[PDB]
Design a protein around this ligand. Structure first.
Ligand SMILES: Nc1ncnc2c1ncn2[C@@H]1O[C@H](COP(=O)(O)OP(=O)(O)O)[C@@H](O)[C@H]1O
Ligand SMILES: [Mg+2]
Ligand SMILES: [Mg+2]
Length: 416
């Protein structure tokens, strides 16, 4: 299935106008781009089109949270057009809208090899289908205007490419509303489809899931679905304290505890036993007197408990050994969620040590897949993006795939 979607390498673009949805939602500090990695990531798809004789590449994206009102002073894509030109080595024409007669005329039959970047899709309520007015009240798009917006986008190319996996979980106009005969995943999308097909359809084995992060209750369906796919699961991060309080009566102090998640811990452990999944929980911890980067630190074990007032913010050295044992056994790994508060150096050792192990595993042929969002931020922070098999470009989207969902943007792509 994820396997059988049309991708850009299989799409004839010679003489065609290409309308391409890209992820240019770059971090900003008052209109200046603080990280251009997303822009670089789209260059292979763009260059492929140009190298294979595309008449034009029209780029559409969003930036920030305009909520369906034009906010060009705060969330304009104009700075991205400057940065893209530098990265591509080609002129980029920036348009101050993304739909309407002037845009359509500009994109109808441009000079061959033209690269065009449109203004922020989310200045229009029709993109998301909803937004907020100037009073901050919810507005709903009108069907006739959604149809018009979609029809306008559809005029801007002869074929469609979606290289914006980070939005593919949303049934937005630019994801599902472009009415062209061929709709292909770009090269970023292709890597997401391929690697998550390994995670979901045909894993190498033993297959290990490393599930960390903060909250349990938002990860129930993720854990549940992964328990149908994996042979081993590490449960780490803040989630672990709910499991340990329930199963061991551990004293956890002020560590994160999920009162709803607590009521399904035994249900998940039961499913793991039923499917033969080996669960690895942490056994030791770095503690902190408060949730702060420069908190006083201590140590604890499951047996010692955590003192009243104190929280467990990372795993300890014996946990790291047990985690490394599981990684050593694995031929495929999916990792969603850091195993400690990686943002702060005092509480990053567990996540860094585990990253080191996943990198070593990759070196001897382990297929290693990092989910988007905070686990991906870890790879960027320690320069390991090139040393694991795959770092997903979409946090929410990777999580929804791993839950077992059909992503509307993926489903909209042409088959075969
Ligand atoms: N022991 C812990 N206590 C509190 N927060 C934690 C702990 N371990 C990890 N975290 C936090 O988990 C967050 C990431 O979790 P999550 O958002 O679920 O990850 P992802 O974006 O990878 O899905 C980070 O902000 C990190 O600081
Ligand atoms: Mg249409
Ligand atoms: Mg993540």
């Amino acid at each position: 299935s994820l396997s059988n979607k049309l991708t850009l390498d299989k799409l004839d673009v010679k003489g065609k106008r290409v309308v391409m949805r890209v992820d240019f939602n770059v971090p900003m500090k008052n209109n200046q781009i603080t990280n251009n990695q997303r822009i670089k990531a789209a260059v292979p798809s763009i260059k492929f089109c140009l190298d294979n004789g595309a008449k034009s590449v029209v780029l559409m994206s969003h930036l920030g949270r305009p909520d369906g009102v034009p906010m060009p002073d705060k969330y304009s894509l104009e700075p991205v057009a400057v940065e893209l030109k530098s990265l591509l080595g080609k002129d980029v024409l920036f348009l101050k809208d993304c739909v309407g007669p002037e845009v359509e005329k500009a994109c109808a039959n441009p000079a061959a090899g033209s690269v065009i970047l449109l203004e922020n899709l989310r200045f229009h309520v029709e993109e998301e289908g909803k937004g907020k007015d100037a009073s901050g009240n919810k507005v709903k798009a009108e069907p006739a205007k959604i149809e018009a917006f979609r029809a306008s986008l559809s005029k801007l190319g002869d074929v469609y490419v979606n290289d914006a996996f980070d939005t593919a979980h949303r049934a937005h106009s630019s994801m599902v509303g472009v009415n062209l005969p061929q709709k292909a995943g770009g090269f970023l999308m292709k890597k997401e489809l391929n690697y998550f097909a390994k995670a979901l359809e045909s894993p190498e084995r033993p297959f290990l899931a490393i599930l960390g992060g903060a909250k349990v209750a938002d990860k129930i369906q993720l854990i549940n679905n992964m328990l149908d796919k994996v042979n081993e699961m590490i449960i780490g991060g803040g989630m672990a304290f709910t499991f340990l309080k329930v199963l061991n009566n551990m004293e956890i102090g002020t560590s994160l505890f999920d009162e709803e998640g607590a009521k399904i811990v035994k249900d998940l452990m039961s499913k793991a036993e039923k499917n033969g999944v080996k669960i690895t929980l942490p056994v030791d911890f770095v503690t902190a007197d408060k949730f702060d980067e420069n908190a006083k630190t201590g140590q604890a074990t499951v047996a010692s408990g955590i003192p009243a007032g104190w929280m467990g913010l990372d795993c300890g050295p014996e946990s790291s050994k047990k985690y490394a044992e599981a990684v050593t056994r694995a031929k495929q790994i999916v990792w969603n969620g850091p195993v400690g508060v990686f943002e702060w150096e005092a509480f990053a050792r567990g996540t860094k040590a585990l990253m080191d192990e996943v990198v070593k595993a990759t070196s001897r042929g382990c297929i290693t897949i990092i989910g988007g969002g905070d686990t991906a931020t870890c790879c960027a922070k320690w320069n390991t993006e090139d040393k694991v098999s795959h770092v997903s470009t979409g946090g929410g989207a990777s999580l929804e795939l791993l839950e077992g969902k059909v992503l509307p943007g993926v489903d909209a792509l042409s088959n075969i």
